[PDB]
Design a protein around this nucleic acid. Structure first.
Ligand SMILES: [Mg+2]
Ligand SMILES: [Mg+2]
Ligand SMILES: [Mg+2]
Ligand SMILES: [Mg+2]
Ligand SMILES: [Mg+2]
Ligand SMILES: [Mg+2]
Lengths: 168, 286, 159, 68
RNA sequence: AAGCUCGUAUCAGUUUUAUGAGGUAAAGCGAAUGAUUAGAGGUUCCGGGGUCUUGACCUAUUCUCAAACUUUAAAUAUGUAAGAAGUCCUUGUUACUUAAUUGAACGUGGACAUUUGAAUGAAGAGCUUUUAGUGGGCCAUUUUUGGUAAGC
RNA sequence: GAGAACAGAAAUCUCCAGUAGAACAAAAGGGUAAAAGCCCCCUUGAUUUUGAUUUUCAGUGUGAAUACAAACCAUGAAAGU
RNA sequence: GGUUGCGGCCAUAUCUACCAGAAAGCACCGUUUCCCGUCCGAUCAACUGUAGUUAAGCUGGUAAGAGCCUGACCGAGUAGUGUAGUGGGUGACCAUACGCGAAACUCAGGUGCUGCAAUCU
């Protein structure tokens, strides 16, 4: 019985973790502007670590969230780099998954030596219709066990489409 | 969950567990000046569910809240409004309906006739000299967020225009721009008679016929074009002021008949004798 | 040196009850107090305004003034060898109606009803309370209740 | 008994040597412990034991003490 | 010490009845926090030796504790009430308060006498002025702090 | 706890569990979860006039604190504060 | 009796794992011209009730369930305690006389009640 409990893409987050701030971060933030069509948001460092070379509230990283049909388009181009292959890991016990890349030029953007080369973090959030019950202001509730997203459900969902496989 | 966690857990209030009542604002909404003794404070409760609008006048008592008057959006069909029972214009009409209904009940409908020439102007219900002060209520919006243009303030306008004195400001009405501290009456008046809906109908008709057929299906079936919703709202306002009394729907069946049918679809608890049988039987099988 | 602050030695007195923290229920604010009412004082730890001093904890007084969110209470305080009158401004969260007379007003109503009821029939309406009296004579039967003999038990350790 | 008697000389005050009627370090009398053991209500866990109660879920009380 | 106003009158180092307040004695640790003995069953791409042990946490148990820990919680002490300045019925004042003669406060007039609202007692109760000496204390039972202890 | 290029015990991102085991300038004890904590917006009531009350107490002072009245203001859709 | 709005007491109401739910209601759900708010119409705002679904929320039932609540000559008149003696004992402490009287433990039962308004085979 699966009349409406079909697995669905909730959102996709593109995270670029830059050690320092300033010119390096601005160029990294430039990549996400046209890769997703949206202005990104920078995150500050929670507490300083001397070894990593960051200070408290230094605005080190940047991320962006994309939803709707645009999210699938970026995911498909991001899966071209992996050749539609993932490990038995990369899938959370909550039904979420993600992967990382080392270059952003191979997505389709030009080299642009005024920007540079950056890696990206892909993470896809999965859910089902009716997840609003945990996000609405009034009468907030919790999703039932049968309606939850499972690791075995996501990998099966990832196999039927994209004709991909999972490693050991 | 360990037994220690459960034992020391303190459950919140039932209305807070269900996420329906904000007790922080409730205390300030219902607490009366102690030197005024049993003088009740009346709340104008306005709630918005899917495809329905609810308006009530409620006073608080130790045993429980007491309703003074009620007005439902689904009662608008008997006043000429059938389409859009949840939009901004519907909120204004049911806000007017509750205001006129309570004035008649208290015998004060003759005085404080409201405004018969609505033009989107911000004004309060002034008291009359050597006479009774207007009935005063305070707006209760519950968990609704306060944003300019929200439908809750639309029901507020109808109650104010209906003769009720409801203290409020005009910075949350549509047409108020944050750059200049003044209201725009011409844009506010359009929302009263569904001006925003009319603009959508004419624009969507000349942009995409498929969506204009999918939406506004009742308008096509009943032959109401983009210039007919404004006049039916105008006629509805005059109909509300004419017969604002409450008429309940005739019950097809009695409460006893309803009770008997609902009994068949309810599961009943088990007493101790058969509960002991179930566990004893499970022992013999396991 | 010694310490004698306003809330000294109130570590346990002003605590909330177990699993009874949080907001105040609304029935506290819906009660009505009038001049002449008898109220008893119990501070609430979560309301820091209009809080009584620790001496008046558990004391009972009479309302003499009513304000917006508070009432005035009169307390007799023994100082030296005589009592002095004390006036307190307390928010309604820290007080409640005293039941030391709600069960006395009903006896007043009962006395009037009994006095009027017997007026037409019998004199000596007998509306004074009496202390517990010694038991009257009675007969105890042994039918099915034959006395059972008991004896002291020997000493044992069972440890 | 002789070992405990010799230990009294190291302590001030008066001490008594009492022969307990309980089974070992348990809080049960000897006849009570024997009755529980023959009914399969005692399970060994290290140096002490665990007993079977009439409360709790049957799912937990069946996998333990299968003899009962 | 001088009295003064009055005299059945209210009062009481007391009990009873009704109704509050408290966190000490005790108790508790397979209840929170903090100590603490012993095994048992499990867990690792996440400690270290060795091809399998010792430490780590997990779960179910076990021994023993707290002036500055605690769910529970006495005994003794402790607040208030037990009527005439009371109760009830009717309706007058106001610039306060109420959508409103709605309410609040204070009153007019009417109805109910001392089994008139538990017990016991009461060299009567209430009140004012003025001034002496004193402001080194110590002992006993019980509770209790410092100290090995002390006629400390 | 389960996951994501460089990335590791600790950088950033996502979900789940989470009665407060956090935080609230300072000593400690109370208090607090659609807040009294975190972030954002607007502000000066940390204002004017003179009384009453609580604590230490001789029912003196000083310090601190509580509830109002009469003004003028802030904030909010509003009750309110 | 079911359901919705507003509540009162604030776990007999919570928590864990499963099953069920006619009618209506509630809800998920569809859309982005307009008021409005975001990195993201996810949250918030508006529009339609039309295209869909009881999958979840929600409600009820089930469990020698955990927790919670109530009671018991269950433990126990035990621990503790007011008062008394030219009582016992080197002492530490203890017994008796006239009174008050716990907690843990054990067992049994219970698993929300209810006010105002509206609506429904
Ligand atoms: Mg609010
Ligand atoms: Mg302050
Ligand atoms: Mg103490
Ligand atoms: Mg002790
Ligand atoms: Mg001298
Ligand atoms: Mg003597």
């Amino acid at each position: 019985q699966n009349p409406m409990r079909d697995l669905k893409i909730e959102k996709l987050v593109l995270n670029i973790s830059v050690g320092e701030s300033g010119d390096r971060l601005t160029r990294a933030s430039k990549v996400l502007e046209q890769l997703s069509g949206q202005t990104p948001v920078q995150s500050k460092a929670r507490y300083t670590v001397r070894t990593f070379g960051i200070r408290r509230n230094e605005k080190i990283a940047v991320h962006v969230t994309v939803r709707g049909p645009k999210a699938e388009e970026i995911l498909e181009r991001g899966l071209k780099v992996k050749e539609y292959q993932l490990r038995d890991r990369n899938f959370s016990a909550t039904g979420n998954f993600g992967f990382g890349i080392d270059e952003h030029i191979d997505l389709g953007i030009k080299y642009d030596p005024s920007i540079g080369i950056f890696g990206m973090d892909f993470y896809v959030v999965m859910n089902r219709p009716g997840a609003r019950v945990t996000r609405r202001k009034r009468c907030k509730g919790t999703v039932g066990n049968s309606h939850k997203t499972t690791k075995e459900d996501t990998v099966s969902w990832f196999k039927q489409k994209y004709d991909a496989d999972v490693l050991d | 969950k360990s037994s220690a966690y459960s034992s020391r857990f303190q459950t919140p209030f039932r209305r807070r567990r269900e996420g329906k009542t904000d007790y922080y604002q409730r205390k300030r909404l219902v607490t009366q000046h102690k030197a005024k003794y049993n003088t009740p404070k009346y709340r104008l409760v306005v709630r918005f569910t899917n495809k329905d609008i609810i308006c009530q006048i409620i006073s608080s008592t130790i045993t429980g809240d007491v309703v003074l008057a009620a007005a439902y959006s689904h009662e608008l069909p008997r006043y000429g409004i059938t389409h859009g029972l949840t939009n901004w214009a519907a909120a204004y009409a049911t806000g007017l309906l509750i205001a006129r209904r309570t004035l008649q009940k208290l015998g004060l409908d003759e005085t404080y006739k409201g405004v018969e020439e609505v033009e989107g102007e911000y004004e309060l219900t002034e008291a009359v000299e050597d006479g009774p002060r207007p009935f005063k209520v305070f707006l209760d919006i519950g968990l609704q967020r306060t944003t300019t243009g929200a439908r809750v303030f639309g029901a507020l306008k109808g109650a104010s225009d209906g003769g009720l004195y409801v203290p409020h400001s005009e910075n949350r009405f549509p047409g108020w721009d944050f750059e200049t501290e003044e209201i725009d009456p011409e844009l506010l008046r359009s929302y009263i008679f569904g001006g925003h809906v009319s603009q959508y109908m004419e624009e969507l008709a000349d942009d995409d016929e498929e969506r204009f057929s999918e939406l506004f299906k009742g308008y096509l079936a009943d032959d109401i074009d983009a210039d007919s919703l404004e006049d039916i709202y105008t006629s509805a306002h005059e109909a509300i002021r004419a017969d604002p009394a409450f008429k309940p729907t005739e019950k097809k069946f009695t409460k006893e008949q309803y009770a008997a049918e609902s009994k068949k679809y309810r599961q009943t608890k088990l007493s101790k004798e058969e509960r002991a049988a179930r566990v004893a039987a499970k022992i013999a099988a396991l | 040196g010694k310490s004698h602050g306003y809330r000294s030695r109130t570590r346990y007195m002003f605590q909330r009850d177990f699993r009874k923290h949080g907001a105040v229920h609304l029935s506290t604010y819906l009660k009505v107090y009038k001049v002449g009412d008898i109220v008893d004082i119990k501070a609430n730890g979560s309301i820091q305004k209009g809080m009584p001093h620790k001496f008046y904890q558990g004391k009972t007084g009479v309302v003499y003034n009513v304000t917006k969110s508070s009432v005035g209470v009169i307390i007799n305080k023994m100082v030296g060898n005589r009592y002095l009158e004390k006036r307190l401004n307390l928010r309604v969260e820290h007080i409640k109606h005293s039941k030391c007379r709600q069960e006395f007003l009903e006896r007043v109503k009962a006395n009037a009803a009994k006095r009027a009821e017997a007026k037409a029939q019998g004199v000596a309406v007998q509306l004074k309370r009496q202390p517990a009296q010694p038991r009257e004579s009675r007969i105890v039967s042994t039918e099915g209740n034959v006395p059972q003999t008991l004896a002291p038990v020997p000493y044992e350790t069972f440890i | 008994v002789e070992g405990l008697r010799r230990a009294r000389y190291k302590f001030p005050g008066q001490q008594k040597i009492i022969l307990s009627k309980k089974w070992g370090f348990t809080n049960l009398d000897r006849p009570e412990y024997l009755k529980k053991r023959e009914a399969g209500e005692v399970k060994d866990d290290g140096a002490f034991v665990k007993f079977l109660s009439k409360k709790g879920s049957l799912e937990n009380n069946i996998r333990e003490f299968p003899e009962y």
